[PDB]
Scaffold this active site. Structure first.
Site, PDB file in Angstrom:
ATOM      1  N   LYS A  48      -0.122 -22.221  -1.730  1.00 16.51           N
ATOM      2  CA  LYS A  48       0.550 -21.214  -0.526  1.00 16.51           C
ATOM      3  C   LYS A  48      -0.737 -21.397  -0.074  1.00 16.51           C
ATOM      4  CE  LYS A  48       3.673 -17.905   0.785  1.00 16.51           C
ATOM      5  NZ  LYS A  48       4.028 -17.444   1.886  1.00 16.51           N
TER       6      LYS A  48
ATOM      7  N   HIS B  83      11.918 -10.277   4.687  1.00 13.88           N
ATOM      8  CA  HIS B  83      11.169 -11.113   5.400  1.00 13.88           C
ATOM      9  C   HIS B  83       9.763 -10.775   5.854  1.00 13.88           C
ATOM     10  CE1 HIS B  83       9.167 -14.213   7.842  1.00 13.88           C
ATOM     11  NE2 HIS B  83       9.131 -13.470   8.265  1.00 13.88           N
TER      12      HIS B  83
ATOM     13  N   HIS C 284       5.573 -10.065  -2.576  1.00 17.55           N
ATOM     14  CA  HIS C 284       4.416  -9.927  -1.227  1.00 17.55           C
ATOM     15  C   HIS C 284       4.068  -8.527  -1.572  1.00 17.55           C
ATOM     16  CE1 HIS C 284       4.930 -12.973   1.462  1.00 17.55           C
ATOM     17  NE2 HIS C 284       6.079 -13.246   1.993  1.00 17.55           N
TER      18      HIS C 284
ATOM     19  N   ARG D 147      -9.022  -6.322  -5.927  1.00 18.46           N
ATOM     20  CA  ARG D 147      -8.626  -5.955  -5.171  1.00 18.46           C
ATOM     21  C   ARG D 147      -9.353  -7.878  -4.263  1.00 18.46           C
ATOM     22  NH1 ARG D 147      -6.522  -4.144  -0.379  1.00 18.46           N
ATOM     23  NH2 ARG D 147      -7.156  -1.739  -0.164  1.00 18.46           N
TER      24      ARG D 147
END
Length: 123
Positions: free
Chosen positions: A40, A114, A13, A21
Site C-alpha cells: 500500500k 471508510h 486502520h 510507533r
C-alpha cells in the site's frame, strides 16, 4: 454478525496499542495486515479506545464534514506509514509518521467503514 466493511475498516486502520510507533512498527504491521503484496502506498492506523471511534458516527464525537464525511471532536493518536521508494513490489519499506489529530471517516449504520486517507498526507 458484524459489518464486513467495518471490520475491513478495523482490520486496516486500527491497532489498539503498539508498544512501538517507529518505522519498524510500520513495516511489521502493514505486512501483518495483508497490506504488502502489493505494497500500500500510504496507510494510517488509529490507536486507543475502539468506542471513541464508533462515536464519530454519531453526534457525541463527530461533526458533519465536506460531503458525506464525518470528522471527530476528539483528537486521536495516529501512525501513518508512508511507503518508501515507489515500487508496489516487496520488499515494502515504510517511514512512520506519528501524530495527534482528529480522524475524518465515513459511517454506515453507525459504524465507520471508510477512512479519508488523504488528509494524513504531506502535500
Amino acid at each position: 454478525q458484524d459489518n464486513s466493511r467495518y471490520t475491513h475498516f478495523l482490520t486496516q486502520h486500527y491497532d489498539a496499542k503498539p508498544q512501538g510507533r517507529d518505522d519498524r512498527y510500520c513495516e511489521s504491521i502493514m505486512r501483518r495486515r495483508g497490506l504488502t503484496s502489493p505494497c500500500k502506498d500510504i496507510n494510517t492506523f488509529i490507536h486507543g479506545n475502539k468506542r471513541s471511534i464508533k462515536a464519530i458516527c454519531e453526534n457525541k464525537n463527530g461533526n458533519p464534514h465536506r460531503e458525506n464525511l464525518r470528522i471527530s471532536k476528539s483528537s486521536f493518536q495516529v501512525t501513518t506509514c508512508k511507503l518508501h521508494g515507489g515500487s508496489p513490489w516487496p520488499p515494502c519499506q515504510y517511514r512512520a509518521t506519528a501524530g495527534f489529530r482528529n480522524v475524518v471517516v465515513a459511517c454506515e449504520n453507525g459504524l465507520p467503514v471508510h477512512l479519508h486517507q488523504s488528509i494524513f498526507r504531506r502535500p
